[PDB]
Write a protein that binds this ligand. Structure first.
Ligand code: Y6D
Ligand code: Y6D
Lengths: 306, 306
């Protein structure tokens, strides 16, 4: 029993973190096989960030413009190329700790583990959702760029995020491991801001199912709803519209608890209209939206506490 | 910016987890140098748990009653002894991944990282406080016994918890790495229950300081309080009494923000009396008590957002 914001064990990723220095700029990189990935803004001075032409800044560098430090060991760079907003440095040594891995572009509402790093040294691990506005509510200080996000399935690390920037509201933006930004953001100084965000409806429903698996039913009711009647309420409370795709994903949790998805939707509509009346769900006074249906099945018992 | 329940990077601990089997019972152990530590209830049958005499159950075992599996590798047990509520198995192989480590007995209110494990395989990592009632609000399923809690300081792992049991309210109890229980609990079936708990006052104050470091002052006020006038309110709201020791620990956060500790106490007294008026602090609608002053200084910027 219990229900926590749980991260994946970080060791497979810790063995990949290095420090990348270009001039007076240092940040983190990811060392897999004989390639180091890092934000391309490593090649900028403070002033360059105001209006960088990265093609023009990079052609001015050699392989020996870059220093890679893996623990105490210096790696020699033997190649470099830009891929979207990342640099790919070829190094003289294959990482002996390279795990089985993939690169994946996650979708909004999906969750991942972040390993916060500074100077190539991991400092902390925590679980993030990709917000519908393509930001994450991370915890990052200066030096954290190149920190990575990931998921683990059966000893394969799916890398999905590399940290590039903090926006003015204190939330965080970055790229996939092909260097494509999540959301409309760019790795230069502009007036860019987080767009309006929404509550991740599917995740709120998953977490209500989690609370029923763990033995709590107080918030259920004898009502049902149509998808459209639900969505009229959802729009009032700045929730994402529920789709039939979302109903189908909740099938297994529905089956484990014997609560029809639209009957759980009716329960959520009543929670949004009435509030929680000073009550808690899995210890929370608010509706949690940073657990996916997959997270709930990973963490909760396969046997409902009936 | 941002503020998250952050765990320590788990890799140094992942390289220590093994599976321990005695008969039909399997759970997790911790492999450091040539010793494996695990809960002594590994030697019990289901029926033995009702009223075990561990001295009498253990004298009936040999070294070869125990199987230790480290990944695919079988370790041979060459020695065994009981230490309080743990077994110490001597094995034929020193763990090559043993980190620099200590064993520490943490105090109530202090925080640690838990690596949830099943069958010697790490599944998740999350941060826990030791509650004043000597339980933790963990997330554990059957098979999780022998999972460990820890802190990391400069590459030294301080191991402080080994998981033994879930109590009837769904919270979790266990021992230090000398096998002494936190709290009054025992590793047998009884009517034992979590005692009454309290809010960790010191941690609530640390987290208010975190919110000011990160640039939020909405909840401050022009009042001060005496320690005793604060404690009269604290007792009404099931908060731990604040002591001068607690005031002294908050000195550095006080200095970084320029808010006197008792002026922060006045702010908390007003939050407890008035509530939060639909507002949030570091994204929370409740007063958080699972971050110590040390956690706040580890995670927050050294420069207050004035
Ligand atoms: O957001 C960042 C860096 N960053 N990331 N997470 C952070 C958390 C707290 C504080 C700063 C943090 N930016 C703006 C930016 C805008 C588009 S892409 C990056 C940032 C990148 C490089 C520099 C810099 C400084 C000196 C030399 N070279 C680069 C200067 C600024
Ligand atoms: O709490 C536990 C085990 N445990 N721990 N975390 C859990 C989370 C969810 C479910 C069960 C969990 N107990 C009770 C207990 C009371 C004092 S010490 C342990 C427990 C230990 C060994 C057994 C057992 C079963 C079969 C064979 N041998 C032992 C049977 C029960």
């Amino acid at each position: 029993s219990g229900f926590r914001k749980m991260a994946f064990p970080s060791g497979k990723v810790e063995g990949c973190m290095v420090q990348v220095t270009c001039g007076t700029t240092t940040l983190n990189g990811l060392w897999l096989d004989d390639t180091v990935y890092c934000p391309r803004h490593v090649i900028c001075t403070a002033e360059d960030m105001l209006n960088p032409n990265y093609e023009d800044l990079l052609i001015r560098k050699s392989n020996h413009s870059f220093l890679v430090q893996a623990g105490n060991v210096q790696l020699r760079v033997i190649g470099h190329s830009m891929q979207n907003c990342l640099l790919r440095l070829k190094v003289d040594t294959s990482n002996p700790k390279t795990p089985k891995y993939k690169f994946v572009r996650i979708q909004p509402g999906q969750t991942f583990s972040v390993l916060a790093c500074y100077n190539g040294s991991p400092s902390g691990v925590y679980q993030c959702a990709m917000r519908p506005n393509h930001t994450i509510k991370g915890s990052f200080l200066n030096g954290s760029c190149g920190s990575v996000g990931f998921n683990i399935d059966y000893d394969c690390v799916s890398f999905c995020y590399m940290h590039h920037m903090e926006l003015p509201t204190g939330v965080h933006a970055g790229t996939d491991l092909e260097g494509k930004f999540y959301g409309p953001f760019v790795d230069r100084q502009t007036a860019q801001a987080a767009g309006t965000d929404t509550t991740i409806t599917l995740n709120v429903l998953a977490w209500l199912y989690a609370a029923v698996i763990n033995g709590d039913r107080w918030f259920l009711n004898r009502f049902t709803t149509t998808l459209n009647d639900f969505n009229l309420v959802a729009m009032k409370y700045n929730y994402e519209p529920l789709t039939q795709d979302h109903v189908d994903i909740l099938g297994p949790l529905s089956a484990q608890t014997g609560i029809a998805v639209l009957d759980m939707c009716a329960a959520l509509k009543e929670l949004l209209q009435n509030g929680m009346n000073g009550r808690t769900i899995l210890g929370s006074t608010i509706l949690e939206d940073e657990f996916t249906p997959f997270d709930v099945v990973r963490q909760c018992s396969g046997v409902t506490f009936q």
